[PDB]
Design a binder for these strands. Structure first.
Ligand SMILES: [Mg+2]
Ligand SMILES: [Mg+2]
Ligand SMILES: [Mg+2]
Ligand SMILES: [Mg+2]
Ligand SMILES: [Mg+2]
Ligand SMILES: [Mg+2]
Ligand SMILES: [Mg+2]
Ligand SMILES: [Mg+2]
Ligand SMILES: [Mg+2]
Ligand SMILES: [Mg+2]
Ligand SMILES: [Mg+2]
Ligand SMILES: [Zn+2]
Lengths: 151, 211, 224, 127, 114, 99, 82, 100
RNA sequence: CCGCACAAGCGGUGGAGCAUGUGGUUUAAUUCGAUGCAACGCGAAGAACCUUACCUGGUCUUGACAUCCACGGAAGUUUUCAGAGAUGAGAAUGUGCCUUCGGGAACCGUGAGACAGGUGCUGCAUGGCUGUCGUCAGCUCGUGUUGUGAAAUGUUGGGUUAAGUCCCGCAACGAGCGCAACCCUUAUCCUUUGUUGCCAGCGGUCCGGCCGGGAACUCAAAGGAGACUGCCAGUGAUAAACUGGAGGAAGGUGGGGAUGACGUCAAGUCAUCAUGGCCCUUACGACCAGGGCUACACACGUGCUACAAUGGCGCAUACAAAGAGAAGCGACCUCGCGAGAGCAAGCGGACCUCAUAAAGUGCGUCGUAGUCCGGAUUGGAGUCUGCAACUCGACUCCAUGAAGUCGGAAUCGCUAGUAAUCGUGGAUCAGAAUGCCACGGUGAAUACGUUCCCGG
């Protein structure tokens, strides 16, 4: 973008609910460009969400995200020729994106003998404001504050 | 960096081929190999004639070839005796009844072969390459060639190093497929060394395609 | 033109007393409100004697180049040239318009070739975008040499508005010996004008007066 | 009246035909669900008809050939939209805002020399 | 549930616990299971001893794991004793099927040596 | 009973001319044509190293496109088949005749 | 390794030399250039030299060696480490 | 390259031709099963005798113009260099650069 | 100022095993070159023999190949012994055609030497071709002006573009090499033509596009039309230019190629070819068998398969494009577990074949483990190609079941149908694909910005 920022491909919504955050979300969980393998695992989570954690999974969909959607961010930059780890805000879209990465990663670190089960759990886990995605929101919300020497 | 071949690129756009005959995978390889051989024999016979072009189209049974040269009377000889025996040698070396036609070019300077080879020769006359090529470009401009470009490379005047050089006259555009550009290379084997020569002649852009 | 005819148009008007050129002292009536006032007593006879020379030149088949690059007065000077079948420069002056006659002739030929080609055809053979681009190039050549496409050779006389603004033209003319007829405001240097008219060069009314009188006398010189 | 349609996407092509009546889908003589083992694809063909909500008004005899399941469906949807514009004669504006008449081009890039993929670059080892 | 070679390797699907024995591989094991008529996925544990008896038979019919290793050892033994090309290589502990020794021969070559 | 004829060439202009001349001559002989049907032309791609010196990057791609036309006359007579034999075509074109 | 429709490839002239040896009883190891020909039952308990490419090496055949190529026994390279 | 090599190739070719028949029928006998296994045995043994150069395997594609062992184009039997050249001139009927 | 240069992102390398090149090493030979970019799965689009130049040995000396003039024999065909074959040694058959009868043609062989030959050295003698900076935006000239003049101006400045793109300013104006465009392809539509291609309508049909027929639509392939910030609104020096919207199939050079301005780097190539000169010439020339180009204490580069539940396994089950092909593909049917084999039609290919695409989808399975993961390696047993497969081919079946549990330092690649994945074909080829060249399936994420890394 040294000339002009090139926009990331603009996405379209899941049909199962007409929503898109799913769409962007599944696009995250997707591995080796296989859409069919990915969407299966979200329904193996959101469906089991609407029951394990209570109805309205699509609202549980984000109660975790809410628990994870970051606010403070650290774009370390050598403004003076020396790298400064300055805490900074990010527009809404990113923190959503970031969070989405922040959870899917946690669905790859739990074992449980299945990937579908891991996504279901971590979602609810962070849906109760407890776990890792929220944690990796905590720590970033911790080291961002810890380094505030200069703007 | 390395330039592309102006003739090749403009093939099927403004440059018709040199051999038209249809062929199939089984006979294509033999047909080109025989075509290469007659051309090789003919060019040597036409070295005296100073041939500019040699086209070869094979009809389904017969083979026909046309020659473009600055010396029609030399190719005619007397009652076509020379070219007659030539038709013979070619018909046989190609194992096909042969028909030989001549279409002499009326503008020898406006053909890159004739000019290039004249240059090669004059160099073998050890004339001053510089004035040689310069006289040639002036003659082409006098004939009205929209533009001319020439290049002599290697051992200019038996130089113990290769002082490769080029000269450009008028306008000779490249990268524009609309432009009609005759091109040709040639060589001259001086006792000191082998010297290559390239020639471009732009005669104006064509409109409406190969027609 | 009579002194009364000029004065109503405002020919006596000039630039500020802050901005004047030294050689213009003889032609300056005085100052009012820190404004230079031009003397019509000199202006009228010099303009008449210049009109005599212009009539003479046009009556020996002279080619006349009206020169002015003011954005306000460009169309006035162009129409002035058209009213007497002459040649003009109404857009920014280009150096070597006179001394470099050969390059201008090649540009004139390119303008003529493009207009002839469009009438002849082959625009359809070109892509529609390319044909439009060729029309734009023809328009650009017209905006550059609309006045001098038919001049044929170097002109026989020059009429210049605001000689200081067009100083390159007068330098060229003097280098060629082509006579210069110019409306010279107080801020201009009058050395380059062989028949000098000291007068306002901005005001549309006085400029149109100059042009109309010159063109009437040029048509008169042509008529014989 | 049978309504002809021609929708093309990726490497699939699709002839489409609409008949007013009870809503039904018959593609390559298959039944949609029976055609696609994926739901998204059934939803994609239904989406243009669903947006106008005229599903019960037109039945569908359609044919698709070439490409893969996603291209098949895309081309089918495209053909559907063209047939809908033809039948209503006022749907062109609705489809244009919707985004279903885009076509989208996007043919796969041809592999290029010296490149393991049409754009992938063979590893260049600096060190 | 004893069978040729190892006894009761693991409680896994018959074909699995079967292939577990050296000299018994996916195909020999599945063919033996088909010959026995015992089910493919039934666990070796909890399988009828009478069925296990049919297995000891159908397997001892093959060269048993202990016997197999002896015989291949003797094969390679001769192969070397003849000092034959592959005989030599075997003695040299190097690839004996034209695999390049120039690079990537570690499988038989073993740990890197300066 | 038919007379089908396949024409192959490297330039469409020649093949088009050949077909045009063969349908029109059929009209002169009162032969009923099936029309100059176009057919998938065959593209042959060749990749070739362009440098004698050792490199992999230097490469070039050429193509041979074989234009292909088909015609056929439902009811031939001496006047139709003999006219095709009488007709003389250019070299670059290919004539295949079947009944 | 080899198609068993026609059987193991052996050289004719090697058959000649070997059978002549045989009928003539033991002879000093005849020499051979065909590393390829397959050992046979008639060639048992006899020696033969075989060009390792720079020189023919003497190998004394035995029952088991039958059914293999003569060349396998001859080494075409040397090696002694680093 | 070496005219020696070119002539070697010409010879290999011309020679290996005539025995095509013999070579062929020989394999036939050999390949052909249901034989007594001696008729073949000697038959294959007989085939062995023929000039080793008889096998088409002995032959080697070689650019006709330059006798070059690598870079052979079955469609032309020429070197990648020489075919490029002949193309650039336009000899190869219809051949043009491919862009897509 | 700009560029996957950086940054934000995915997927990697660097670990493992193996394929693959290179150096080192060894060899008799392991033939020759390439050596940062711009060598190192490079030449080589394919070393068993051949290939082939390297080694070993066998051999020939006007010769393997060419012209020369003699002498003789038709040309040939078949056939035997020795040899490893080179080759000798024979031994038979034929001993032909034109001729104006002389001979000639035709070849074959022996002699004469003139001569042949070189993959011998010299890319620092060169031509030719190619790599690079770099498709980088630059490089210049005519005229003019000024300078007595070496010169400068133009190309400078400011907006502003992908661009020395364009405009306004500007003693500069024009132009060229260029850029752009013209080319091919793809994205929409229209005309013409309708078989081997299609079936909308129908009549029939065994219900198969299959057949009456249809010529609609798909496709097919020749022609065409369409994208121009055209248009509108809003900025901007009112100019250029930008932005958004509408229309539109596509929007701002619509996507992709080809095209490399000078010029640079004694770049690379004298083993494509050509060639200056030097050296061998009973041999650095020529033929033949075997070995060698595949060696392994080793080191680097490139690539492939993995480490496993988005997985594996089994069962059923689905959507392609582009091509190749008559010493060919090789249908069908029979045999075999397969490798294949037999049989054998059709196809020179919109007709036949290769060939029934995988990922997917549906069902059971396994339940985290060195596992039902991965697959190396090895034994055994065969198949095929090629006289011939041991060194040293490919593939099948049985068994073995490594290492490896996502790989430091460091590092590399990509901004959309992209990367990633999964299949497909082709070249080279008797046979010998992880290598190359193409075709499709599914198909991401991020790019705040330019401080910086490099590059220009
Ligand atoms: Mg070979
Ligand atoms: Mg060398
Ligand atoms: Mg070198
Ligand atoms: Mg050098
Ligand atoms: Mg050897
Ligand atoms: Mg090697
Ligand atoms: Mg690698
Ligand atoms: Mg598995
Ligand atoms: Mg694990
Ligand atoms: Mg590759
Ligand atoms: Mg693909
Ligand atoms: Zn003034």
């Amino acid at each position: 973008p040294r000339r002009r920022v090139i926009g990331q491909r603009k996405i379209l919504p899941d049909p199962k609910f007409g929503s898109e955050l799913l769409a962007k979300f599944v696009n995250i969980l997707m591995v080796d460009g296989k859409k069919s393998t990915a969407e299966s695992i979200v329904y193996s989570a959101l469906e089991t969400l609407a029951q394990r954690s209570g109805k309205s999974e699509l609202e549980a969909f984000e109660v975790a995200l809410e628990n994870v959607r970051p606010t403070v961010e650290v774009k370390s930059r050598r403004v003076g020729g020396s790298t400064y780890q300055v805490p900074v805000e990010v527009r809404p879209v990113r923190r959503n994106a970031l969070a989405m990465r922040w959870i899917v990663e946690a669905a790859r670190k739990r074992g449980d003998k299945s990937m579908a089960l891991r996504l279901a759990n971590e979602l609810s886990d962070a849906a109760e404001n407890k776990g890792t995605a929220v944690k990796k929101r905590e720590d970033v919300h911790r080291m961002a504050e810890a380094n505030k020497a200069f703007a | 960096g390395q330039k592309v071949h102006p003739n090749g690129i403009r093939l099927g756009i403004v440059k018709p081929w040199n051999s038209t005959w249809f062929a199939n995978t089984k006979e294509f390889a033999d047909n080109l190999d025989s075509d290469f051989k007659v051309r090789q024999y003919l060019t040597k016979e036409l070295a005296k004639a100073s041939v500019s072009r040699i086209v070869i189209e094979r009809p389904a049974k017969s083979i026909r070839v046309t020659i473009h040269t600055a010396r029609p009377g030399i190719v005619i000889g007397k009652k076509g005796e020379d070219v007659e025996k030539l038709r013979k040698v070619v018909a046989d070396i190609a194992g096909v009844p042969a028909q030989i036609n001549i279409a002499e070019v009326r503008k020898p300077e406006l053909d890159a072969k004739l000019v290039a080879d004249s240059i090669t020769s004059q160099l073998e006359r050890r004339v001053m390459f510089r004035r040689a090529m310069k006289r040639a470009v002036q003659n082409a401009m006098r004939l009205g060639a929209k533009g001319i470009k020439v290049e002599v490379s290697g051992r200019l005047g038996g130089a113990e190093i290769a002082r490769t050089e080029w000269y450009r006259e008028g306008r000779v555009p490249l990268h524009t497929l609309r432009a009609d550009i005759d091109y040709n290379t040639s060589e001259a084997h001086t006792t000191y060394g082998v010297i290559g020569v390239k020639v471009w002649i732009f005669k104006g852009e064509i409109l409406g395609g190969m027609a | 033109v009579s002194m009364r005819d000029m004065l109503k148009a405002g020919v006596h008007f000039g630039h500020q007393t802050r901005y004047w050129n030294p050689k213009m002292k003889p032609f300056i009536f005085g100052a009012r409100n820190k404004v230079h006032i031009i003397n019509l007593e000199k202006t009228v006879p010099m303009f008449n004697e210049a009109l005599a020379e212009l009539n003479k030149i046009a009556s020996r088949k002279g080619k006349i180049l009206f020169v002015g690059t003011k954005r306000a007065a460009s169309e006035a000077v162009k129409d002035a040239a058209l009213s007497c079948d002459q040649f003009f420069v109404n857009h920014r002056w280009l150096g070597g318009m006179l001394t470099n006659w050969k390059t201008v002739r090649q540009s004139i030929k390119r303008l003529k070739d493009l207009e002839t080609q469009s009438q002849d055809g082959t625009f359809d053979k070109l892509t529609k975008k390319e044909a439009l681009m060729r029309t734009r190039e023809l328009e650009k050549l017209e905006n550059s040499l609309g006045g001098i496409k038919d001049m044929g050779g170097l002109p026989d006389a020059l009429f210049v508005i605001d000689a200081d603004h067009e100083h390159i033209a007068i330098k060229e003319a003097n280098n060629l010996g082509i006579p210069v007829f110019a409306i010279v405001d107080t801020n201009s240097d009058p050395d380059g004008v062989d028949f000098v008219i000291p007068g306002n060069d901005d005001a549309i009314r006085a400029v149109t007066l100059y042009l109309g009188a010159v063109a009437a006398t040029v048509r008169e010189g042509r008529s014989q | 009246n049978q309504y002809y349609g021609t929708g093309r996407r990726k490497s699939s092509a699709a002839r489409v035909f609409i008949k007013p009546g009870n809503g039904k889908i018959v593609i390559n003589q298959r039944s949609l669900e029976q055609y696609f083992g994926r739901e998204t694809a059934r939803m994609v063909v239904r989406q243009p008809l669903e947006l106008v909500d005229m599903v019960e008004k037109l039945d569908l005899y359609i044919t698709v050939k070439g490409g893969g399941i996603s291209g098949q469906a895309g081309a089918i949807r495209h053909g559907i939209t063209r047939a809908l514009m033809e039948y209503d004669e006022s749907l062109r504006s609705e489809l244009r805002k919707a985004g279903f008449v885009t076509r989208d081009a996007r043919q796969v890039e041809r592999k290029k020399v010296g490149l393991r993929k049409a754009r992938r670059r063979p590893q260049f080892s600096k060190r | 549930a004893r069978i040729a070679g190892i006894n009761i390797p693991d409680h896994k699907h018959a074909v699995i616990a079967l292939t577990s024995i050296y000299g018994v591989g996916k195909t020999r094991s599945k063919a033996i299971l088909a010959a026995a008529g015992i089910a493919e996925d039934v666990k070796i544990s909890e399988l009828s001893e009478g069925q296990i008896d049919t297995l000891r038979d159908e397997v001892a019919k093959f060269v048993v794991e202990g016997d197999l290793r002896r015989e291949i050892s003797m094969s390679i033994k001769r192969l070397m004793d003849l000092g034959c090309y592959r005989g030599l290589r075997h003695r040299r502990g190097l690839p004996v099927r034209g695999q390049r020794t120039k690079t990537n021969a570690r499988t038989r070559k073993g740990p890197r040596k300066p | 009973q038919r007379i089908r004829i396949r024409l192959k060439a490297f330039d469409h202009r020649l093949i088009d001319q050949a077909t045009a001349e063969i349908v029109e001559t059929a009209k002169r002989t009162g032969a009923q044509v099936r029309g100059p049907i176009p057919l998938p032309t065959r593209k042959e791609r060749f990749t070739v190293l362009i440098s004698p010196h050792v490199n992999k990057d230097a490469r070039d791609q050429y193509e041979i496109r074989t234009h292909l036309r088909l015609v056929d006359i439902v009811e031939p007579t001496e006047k139709t088949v003999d006219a095709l034999m009488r007709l003389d075509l250019a070299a670059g074109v290919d004539v295949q005749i079947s009944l | 390794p080899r198609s068993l429709k026609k059987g193991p490839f052996i050289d004719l002239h090697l058959l000649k030399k070997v059978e002549k040896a045989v009928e003539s009883g033991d002879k000093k190891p005849l020499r051979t250039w065909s590393r390829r020909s397959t050992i046979f039952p008639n060639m048992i308990g006899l020696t033969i030299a075989v060009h390792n490419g720079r020189q023919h090496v003497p190998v004394f055949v035995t029952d088991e060696m039958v059914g293999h190529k003569l060349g396998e026994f001859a080494p075409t390279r040397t090696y002694r480490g680093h | 390259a070496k005219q020696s090599m070119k002539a070697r190739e010409v010879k290999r070719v011309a020679l290996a031709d005539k025995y095509f028949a013999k070579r062929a029928e020989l394999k036939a006998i050999i390949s052909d099963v249901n034989a007594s296994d001696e008729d073949r045995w000697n038959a294959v043994l007989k085939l062995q005798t023929l000039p080793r150069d008889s096998s088409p395997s002995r032959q080697r594609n070689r650019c006709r113009q330059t006798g070059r062992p690598h870079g052979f184009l079955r469609k032309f039997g020429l070197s990648r260099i020489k075919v490029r050249e002949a193309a650039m001139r336009g000899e190869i009927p219809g051949l043009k650069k491919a862009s897509w």
